[PDB]
């Protein structure tokens, strides 16, 4: 049931609602909307997509000094290790971007150009 909702609005006041979901499995999935249809992506993908970073930078980003949350230590290990399970071949951020472009190229209408 738990989840976060942030309504990001661009300077021009056009809005875009972004949701985070906690799966029972520890997995977190991100909801968004494109061509007013909804689309779900694993959050660790959008993280590795934003900036080149280490796994330790994301881990440190979330729990940080909070080293005592066995609850969070284990859920977050499920998250990162689980991503390592699904995508052993996304070794760098650029490749990840290639995976996103490849999977949305049909709908972002950028093709024969981008």
């Amino acid at each position: 049931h738990y989840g976060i909702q942030i309504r990001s609005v661009r300077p021009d006041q056009t809005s875009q609602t972004n949701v985070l979901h906690y799966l029972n499995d520890g997995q977190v999935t991100f909801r968004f909307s494109w061509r007013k249809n909804e689309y779900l992506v694993p959050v660790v993908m959008i993280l590795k997509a934003l900036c080149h970073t280490s796994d330790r930078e994301i881990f440190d980003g979330i729990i940080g000094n909070d080293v005592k949350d066995s609850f969070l230590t284990d859920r977050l290990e499920l998250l990162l290790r689980g991503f390592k399970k699904r995508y052993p071949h996304l070794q760098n951020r650029t490749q990840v971007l290639q995976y996103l472009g490849d999977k949305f190229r049909v709908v972002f209408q950028a093709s024969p150009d981008q």
């Binding site: 909804e38 992506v41 999977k103 049909v106 709908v107």
Partner: protein, 59 residues
């Protein structure tokens, strides 16, 4: 491109993907070929059934 679209769909939704896949199941090969021959025979039956109406417009 539709197939590629399907891939995008695969990432987005398990459930919706399931629905589209179901649509594919419904299609199947569509015209089967052996089936097509049998159907041709059926078409002959249709010939009998057919509403042999006329030229429609010229008349």
């Amino acid at each position: 491109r539709p197939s590629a679209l399907r891939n995008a769909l695969g990432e987005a939704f398990g459930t919706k993907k399931a629905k589209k896949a179901i649509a594919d199941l419904e299609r199947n090969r569509i015209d089967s070929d052996k089936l097509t021959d049998s159907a041709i025979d059926i078409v002959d039956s249709v010939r009998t059934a057919s509403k042999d109406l006329p030229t429609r417009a010229q008349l």
